[PDB]
Design a protein around this nucleic acid. Structure first.
Ligand SMILES: Nc1ncnc2c1ncn2[C@@H]1O[C@H](COP(=O)(O)OP(=O)(O)NP(=O)(O)O)[C@@H](O)[C@H]1O
Ligand SMILES: [Mg+2]
Ligand SMILES: [Zn+2]
Ligand SMILES: [Zn+2]
Lengths: 258, 655, 665
DNA sequence: CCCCCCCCCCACCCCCCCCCCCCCCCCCCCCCC
DNA sequence: GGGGGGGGGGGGGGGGGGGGGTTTTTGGGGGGGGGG
């Protein structure tokens, strides 16, 4: 932070910030009488990107189905927005206490109203309390690039050579279909269809604005005796950006959007 | 060597920025005086390639409109004295402050005593080259000029806000000089300058001045936010000329300053020194306007003897055949003339159309095209439309804690079209909400103590499949489809769309479809200019008039032209209606009613509208009769359709 | 009024556009009439800021970035012209603007000082004006690795080429000006946060002392950057060959440069005396000792558990404390009942020179990188091996004259310069037999002793405590050297008669007054006293006659007040204090004078687990001292119950009972 | 099996505090014994 | 040469002023259950 005094144009700068919005206590000018009358210089001061994200205990890690415990994680700078709602993530960073900044005294804010700690001169009669939060310096998830260059130029040269040895093969088309749903026997036509669904058509926009669908819609009619759901389990396990749902369990709203 | 109050610099010195920061450079008074001369020179001597000063013409127009706003194109500043464009991007709060004074000086030069009409001018920057999504805003954008897109989610009322405010100290000599009010913070008076001490203060009564104010919540557009992620938003503040340039639910593109301020509430609840943020708007965009030459182009093409047919062929050009649907859509999209008989009886001008027919016959695609082409449009498929979501609804206002109205689709599309795809899939309680807005052209809510009537001037175009999923030409209409007579009668053109196997017709259609697919393939003088030229080359293969021209032509014909009936073939329309009524006594047939008689007149007026003709000719009326009679005849079962078509031929094959 | 200020700033901004700028055809290009513009800016400095005592141009020139964005480009490109041409050889004109740029750099980098004589405007503008000099120092060192430094040496070489006979007064001035540029660039250092004291302090004090502008970090200003850029521009080579060529108009600035290098760096840092990681592990273990100590001073259960101890005293009365651990340890309970007091006795307070070893925090090291350490140590090694004796002889042959007009800054920098290099060469020679004590022989030539004695005696008589402290430091290193050359062997006998009588008395009276002054003042007094005592013992006019002048209570008060800082003192300093106590108490047997409760408390606080390192040699000495001290105190109390009360007070200067108190018959 | 109903959930005084002023206490310096 | 007295600075205390301090109805959507 950086501040210019009200009664003289002198500037305080590189003012470190506590959890409360922190302003200078003394004027650097030995002539000046000021304390605590300031204007923040927005241009000289430096901000950082900041984002709180709330996380809850993993569903498969709760011991006996009781409530999951929660925590507040602060992301900053380049690490913001790498999380997403419903994502399963691993963070690393600092476990920190965050005070009740209202209780600590704050410009323009009346204080808030567990037993805290008191006697600290900033508090006078008030008693300060703390939440835990996690100041995360790093994030990863643990749970369409449709141009050749932006895809290829991310690959390892080993992967490039595997791609070349695949396209070299004149009859790779059969090898692809036999690689679909390898745990289910037979039914070559269905496997061919699923291959030609993960490989979609080319979506088009006409001069009049009218769109043409690129996606391919497939139906697999089968008796409940048939190994039918294996195809859905396979493709939802395999294909990126996909979901499984049951016909009667899901309503019209639940299917499109509610 | 020089008078210090008039010391000034060269342009290369201005590129030679040597303050610590851009704002420190703009405010350095020798630099500031030079910047004033620089922007003034730009507004004077920048020209179109025709040699006309653009900003001469715009200033001329500004005064003719008595406007407070001067539209400046950023690219014109990037094209000449580009250092000023860089400064404008990096430091807009100072630079616009200078540029406003320059714009006022320029128009005062061009229009003496414009200070009496407006004391100030705002330069409204447009065509700023770089765009962000609301998800994409970051710290590095703070106090920069930004360009953002979103949907206006919530618009507050229009308020006066203080602009220049003097204050009274209750001690000493009371009056304090005028502070300029901003969009984020109250004026703080730490001490009174006249007695150099703290004190209480009040706004001064001798003089103060006000400007309009309005906040808008701008949110990520629903198709633009990635799926699963939540929509981000920001508060946009509109001042002076900009208030009520948008209304809730409209997608807009906003140019403004991304600013921030300390807010103890945000800090209090988050526990970090984290600031609230806004966009202070400097321009708002919703494409359907036109130039004087564009107006002349509409007048030119309107003279063509084939213009109705060229328009009709141009409706949904990438859909083969279905010229009856294209005619019905054209008539609906131009509309009739709404009338009011001495104020004692108001009559619908909108034409409602139903596309009833078999699967895979481009009905949904036609509706999506009309959503593309109409100047105000809304689209709502089947089960996705509730009764109150179509007309209007009442909500317990979350910030006012009282009941307020929310306009449905037929409010949003008022003076426009509403597009209900898969109309047969609606719940009947949802469907029957349509009735009042579809004929009386209003919505009369009376709920929760609210009692009022809204305007709903929509032409509704709907697409439906027959009962069981496919048509049956051995059944009359009322047995093909579950819709009742009061709703069928309101759709005053009916198009029945049958998918029949027919060898050469399917040959031609399939040829057209595969041609369309290669003609729509993505891979199929600067490069951008060449590509737009190639797009025009592709388009003229199937559209007899340009689609971009067609949209503005439709909007022009709608807003300027109001064809009168005259020289009316009253006996012909009377005999047509009388025969249609008599032959409609067949119990299942399309239920001919007086609103169909008025529909003939609406359709004739729409055809005269297509010609930009303020009088309805006999050709317009004859085409209208042909459409309505063919629409009636086409709906009949095969057992009687030949006999009926032969009987009605005297009215229509005379044309 | 401020209208004059905005007129001024407008003029300086226009001049900033007149100097020059980049050319897109990127290269910097001079402006038209560039020499006239530079001359006019130099004129502005003299015309306004000097003659009216303002510094307003010095502020405006920083606002419009003339130094960073014109003058350094001009000098660096001119250096590139000359250096590229030198391999291949209208330079006769561009040389003039290069010289005038260096003049302007010496002006804008001129060391600012504020005093009572400085104007109101100057003392107002001082704090922010310093910040721009720090930006200048950063830019000068960093820009193209500091190629402007190579421009400066080229401007100097262009008079060093013409002979000692040839160089005119203007050429001599130009060389001196280049030395002032190097001195200034070394000398810029962050300013002090000068608070106004009219209005009382709030419930929180000053938020931070940091004065650096936001584009500067202290690493940009650190000696590592100076040494790196000077090595990469061969500034060290220039200085070494310049002092090699000393055969004296420029001698004062050259001395001053060596002072400004040395003034804040400790000699032992240049000598060792996975290794960094191993030492980090050692540091972590050392603080882990403090962890296992504070743990015993911490509650085993939460703070609200709150069991109440009651201390019944030896009398029929009771005190109460909440210390959960204190329930089982009356030591904790007693010192907590003491710390509980809201009362504190009120305590008392207590410029034209820079910070240095004279006034830094006692442990304040400079953290060299290894390459910068090598470059610096080899440079000062070669300086000692070439330039020391001649430069010291030159400046002392001056300074024997004009002592009356020797300004205080000049005095302190001279004494510190002498002391630092004498101490360094002693240390390097104690490390390497290859390094020779006689390579600093000029220190011992009697003219030097006479001058340093005159400076110390005059400063003491004049009550100039700053120069007094510096002369005391210089005396310490002089006596250190003298003891070494006493072992290495006539001059030792000579000075050992010259420091008789008045010099004994003066040196005895420094640690009488020293207790009133800063920790470093006291430290230098103690160091001098130990050096004096070991010198006089090495000699051993009478030994008892001299040491009796030291063994008196004001000296003991200085020693105790110095020793109060024991947590922050170094182990060798505690050793020195306890060796003094060893002599005074055990050997000289004036043991009555140390039976006083201030020492008793101090002994317990450092022998407590919260005190010294368990394995420290100084802890061993304090323990060894304390056993004997307690035995002697026990004996004296058994022989005198009056001394149970006498322990509380200064001993009785009424000799008729004072002798009995002192010895007890 | 489909449609309609109906059910559910949701929106003026007193204390703390801060500033200002006055007096007292403690240190330092100068004079006297 | 040391002790007392006088004078100046600095700190602390006291006083005065100021500001802060949930059920009930209505409407809408979605889900679940029952009857033809
Ligand atoms: N005449 C045509 N020309 C071009 N494409 C056509 C034509 N008829 C149908 N199509 C294509 O058929 C597809 C489906 O069109 P669509 O608008 O959904 O038909 P629809 O009439 O709405 N059938 P439905 O939704 O089952 O009632 C689109 O991709 C169109 O391009
Ligand atoms: Mg459809
Ligand atoms: Zn100030
Ligand atoms: Zn006032």
């Amino acid at each position: 932070a950086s501040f210019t005094c009200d009664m003289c144009r002198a500037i305080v700068d590189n003012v470190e910030q506590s959890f409360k919005y922190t302003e200078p206590t003394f004027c650097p000018n030995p002539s000046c009488e000021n304390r605590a009358f300031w204007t923040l210089n927005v241009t000289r001061s430096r901000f950082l990107d900041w984002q709180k994200v709330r996380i809850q205990e993993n569903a498969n890690e709760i011991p006996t189905g009781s409530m999951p415990r929660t925590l507040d994680v602060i992301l900053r700078g380049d690490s913001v927005e790498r999380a997403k709602p419903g994502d399963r993530c691993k963070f690393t960073g600092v476990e920190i206490v965050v005070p009740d900044v209202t209780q600590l005294g704050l410009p323009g804010v009346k204080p808030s109203s567990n037993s805290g700690v008191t006697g600290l001169r900033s508090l006078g009669v008030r008693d300060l309390t703390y939440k835990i939060s996690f100041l995360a310096c790093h994030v990863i998830s643990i749970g369409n690039e449709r141009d050749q260059e932006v895809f290829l130029n991310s690959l390892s040269s080993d992967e490039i050579n595997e791609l070349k040895e695949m396209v070299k093969d004149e009859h790779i088309y059969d090898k692809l279909v036999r690689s679909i749903a390898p745990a289910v026997f037979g039914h070559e036509a269905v496997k061919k269809g699923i291959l030609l669904q993960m490989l979609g058509g080319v979506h088009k926009s006409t001069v009049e604005g009218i769109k043409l669908r690129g996606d391919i819609n497939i139906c697999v009619v089968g008796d409940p005796s048939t190994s039918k759901s294996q195809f859905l389990k396979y493709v939802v396990g395999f294909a990126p950006r996909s979901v499984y749902t049951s016909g009667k369990a899901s309503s019209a709203a639940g299917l499109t959007a509610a | 060597d020089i008078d210090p109050l008039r010391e000034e610099l060269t342009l290369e010195s201005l590129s030679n920025v040597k303050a610590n920061s851009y704002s420190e450079w703009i405010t350095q008074p020798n630099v500031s005086r030079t910047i004033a001369r620089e922007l003034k020179s730009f507004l004077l001597e920048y020209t179109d390639e025709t040699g006309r000063s653009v900003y001469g013409a715009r200033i001329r127009t500004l005064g003719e409109m008595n406007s407070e706003s001067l539209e400046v194109n950023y690219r014109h500043l990037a094209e000449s004295k580009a250092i000023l464009a860089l400064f404008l991007a990096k430091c807009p709060e100072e630079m616009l402050k200078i540029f406003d004074l320059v714009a006022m000086e320029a128009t005062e030069l061009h229009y003496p005593d414009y200070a009496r009409i407006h004391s100030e001018i705002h330069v409204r920057i447009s065509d700023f080259p770089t765009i962000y999504s609301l998800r994409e805003l970051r710290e590095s954008n703070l106090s920069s000029l930004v360009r953002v897109t979103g949907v206006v989610t919530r618009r507050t009322g229009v308020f006066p806000q203080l602009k220049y405010v003097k204050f009274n100290c209750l001690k000493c000599g009371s009056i304090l000089g005028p502070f300029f009010q901003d969009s984020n913070e109250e004026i703080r008076i730490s001490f009174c300058t006249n007695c150099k001490s703290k004190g209480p203060f009040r706004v001064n009564g001798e003089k103060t001045v006000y400007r309009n104010y309005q906040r808008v919540t701008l949110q990520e557009a629903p198709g633009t936010v990635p799926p699963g992620r939540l929509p981000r938003h920001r508060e946009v503040i509109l001042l002076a000329d900009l208030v009520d340039v948008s209304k809730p639910g409209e997608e807009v593109e906003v140019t403004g300053i991304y600013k921030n301020n300390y807010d103890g509430n945000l800090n209090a609840k988050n526990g970090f020194p984290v600031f609230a943020t806004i966009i202070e708007a400097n321009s708002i965009k919703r494409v359907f306007s036109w130039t004087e030459e564009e107006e002349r182009e509409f007048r030119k093409i309107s003279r063509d003897r084939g213009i109705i047919d060229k328009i009709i062929s141009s409706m949904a050009p990438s859909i083969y055949g279905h010229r009856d649907i294209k005619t019905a859509v054209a008539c609906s999209l131009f509309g009739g003339v709404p009338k009011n008989v001495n104020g004692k009886h108001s009559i619908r001008g909108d034409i409602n159309v139903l596309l009833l027919g078999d699967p895979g016959t481009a009905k949904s695609q036609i509706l999506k095209y009309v959503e593309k082409t109409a100047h105000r449009a809304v689209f709502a498929t089947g089960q996705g439309a509730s009764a109150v979501g179509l007309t209007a609804s009442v909500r317990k206002d979350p910030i006012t804690k009282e009941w307020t109205l929310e306009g449905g689709a037929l409010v949003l599309a008022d003076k426009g079209v509403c597009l209900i795809d898969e109309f047969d899939k609606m719940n009947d309680q949802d469907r029957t909400s349509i009735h009042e807005a579809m004929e009386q052209q209003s919505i009369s809510i009376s709920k929760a103590g609210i009692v009022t009537t809204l305007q709903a001037r929509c032409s509704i175009i709907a697409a439906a499949n027959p009962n069981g999923g496919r048509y049956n030409s051995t059944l009359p209409l009322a047995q093909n489809v579950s819709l009742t007579e009061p709703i069928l009668s309101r759709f005053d053109i009916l198009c029945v769309v049958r998918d029949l196997v027919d060898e050469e017709a399917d040959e031609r259609l399939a040829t057209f479809v595969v041609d369309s697919h290669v003609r729509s393939h993505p891979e199929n003088l600067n490069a951008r200019q060449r590509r737009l030229q190639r797009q025009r080359k592709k388009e003229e293969e199937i559209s007899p008039i340009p689609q971009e021209l067609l949209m503005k032509y439709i909007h022009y014909a709608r807003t300027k032209i109001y064809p009168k009936l005259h020289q009316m073939d009253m006996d012909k329309v009377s005999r047509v209606y009388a025969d249609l009524r008599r032959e409609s006594i067949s119990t299942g047939s399309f239920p001919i009613t007086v609103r169909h008689l008025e529909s003939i007149l609406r359709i004739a007026e729409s055809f005269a509208k297509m010609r930009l003709s303020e009088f309805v000719s006999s050709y317009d009326l004859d085409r209208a009769i042909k459409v309505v009679v063919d629409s009636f005849v086409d709906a009949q079962k095969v057992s009687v359709r030949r006999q009926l078509r032969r009987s009605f031929a005297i009215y229509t094959l005379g044309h | 009024a401020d209208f004059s200020l905005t007129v001024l700033r407008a003029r300086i901004a226009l001049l900033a556009t007149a100097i020059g700028g980049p050319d897109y055809t990127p290269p910097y290009k001079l402006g038209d009439d560039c020499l006239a513009c530079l001359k006019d800016l130099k004129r502005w400095f003299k015309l306004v800021d000097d003659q009216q005592k303002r510094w307003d141009v010095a502020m405006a020139v920083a606002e419009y970035r003339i130094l960073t964005d014109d003058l350094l480009p001009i000098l660096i490109d001119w250096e590139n012209k000359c250096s590229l041409a030198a391999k291949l050889a209208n330079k006769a004109y561009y040389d003039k603007i290069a010289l005038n740029c260096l003049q302007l750099l010496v002006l804008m980098t001129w060391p600012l000082i504020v005093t009572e004589q400085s104007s109101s405007n100057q003392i107002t503008l001082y704090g922010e004006l310093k910040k721009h000099q720090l930006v200048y120092k950063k830019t000068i060192l960093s820009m193209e690795s500091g190629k402007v430094l190579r421009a400066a040496i080229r401007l100097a070489l262009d008079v060093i080429k013409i002979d000692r006979l040839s160089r005119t007064p203007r050429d001599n001035m130009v060389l001196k000006l280049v030395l002032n540029f190097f001195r200034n660039v070394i000398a810029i250092e962050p300013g002090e946060f000068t608070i106004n004291t009219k209005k009382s302090m709030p419930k929180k004090g000053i938020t931070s002392i940091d004065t650096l502008p936001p584009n500067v970090s202290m690493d940009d200003i650190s000696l590592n950057t100076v040494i790196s850029s000077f090595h990469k521009n061969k500034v060290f080579g220039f200085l070494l060959t310049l002092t090699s060529s000393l055969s004296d108009f420029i001698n004062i600035p050259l001395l001053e440069i060596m002072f400004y290098f040395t003034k804040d760096v400790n000699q032992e840092l240049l000598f060792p005396r996975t290794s960094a990681g191993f030492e980090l592990s050692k540091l972590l273990q050392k603080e882990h000792q403090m962890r296992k100590n504070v743990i015993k001073h911490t509650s085993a259960r939460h703070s609200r558990f709150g069991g109440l101890l009651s201390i019944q005293t030896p009398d029929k009365t009771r005190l109460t404390v909440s210390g959960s651990q204190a329930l089982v340890d009356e030591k904790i309970a007693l010192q907590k009942l003491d710390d509980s007091k809201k009362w504190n006795k009120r305590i008392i307070k207590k410029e034209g020179l820079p910070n240095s070893l004279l006034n830094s925090q006692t442990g304040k090291a400079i953290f060299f990188t290894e390459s910068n350490g090598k470059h610096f140590k080899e440079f000062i090694n070669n300086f000692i091996d070439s330039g020391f004796n001649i430069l010291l002889h030159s400046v002392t042959n001056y300074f024997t004259t004009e002592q009356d007009r020797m300004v205080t800054l000049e005095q302190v920098e001279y004494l510190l310069f002498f002391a630092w290099f004498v101490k360094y060469q002693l240390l390097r020679s104690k490390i390497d037999n290859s390094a020779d004590i006689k390579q600093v022989s000029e220190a011992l030539k009697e003219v030097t002793f006479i001058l340093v004695s005159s400076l110390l005696r005059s400063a003491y008589d004049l009550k100039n405590w700053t120069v007094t402290h510096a002369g005391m430091i210089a005396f310490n290193e002089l006596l250190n050297l003298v003891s070494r050359t006493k072992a290495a062997q006539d001059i030792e006998f000579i000075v050992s008669r010259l420091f008789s009588d008045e010099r004994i008395q003066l040196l005895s009276n420094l640690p009488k007054i020293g207790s009133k002054y800063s920790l470093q003042f006291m430290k230098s007094c103690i160091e001098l006293t130990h050096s004096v005592l070991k010198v006089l013992e090495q000699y051993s006019v009478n030994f008892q006659k001299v040491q009796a002048n030291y063994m008196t209570e004001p000296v003991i008060e200085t020693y105790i007040n110095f020793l109060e800082r024991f947590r922050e003192l170094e182990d060798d300093s505690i050793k020195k204090v306890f060796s003094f106590f060893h002599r005074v108490f055990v050997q000289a047997k004036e043991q009555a004078l140390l039976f006083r409760f201030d020492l008793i408390i101090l002994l317990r606080e450092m022998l407590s687990p919260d005190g010294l390192d368990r394995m420290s040699r100084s802890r061993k000495y304090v323990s060894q001292f304390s056993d004997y001290f307690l035995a002697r105190l026990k004996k004296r109390l058994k022989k005198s119950p009056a001394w149970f009360v006498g322990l509380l007070f200064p001993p009785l200067h009424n000799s008729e009972v004072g002798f009995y108190q002192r010895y007890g018959e």
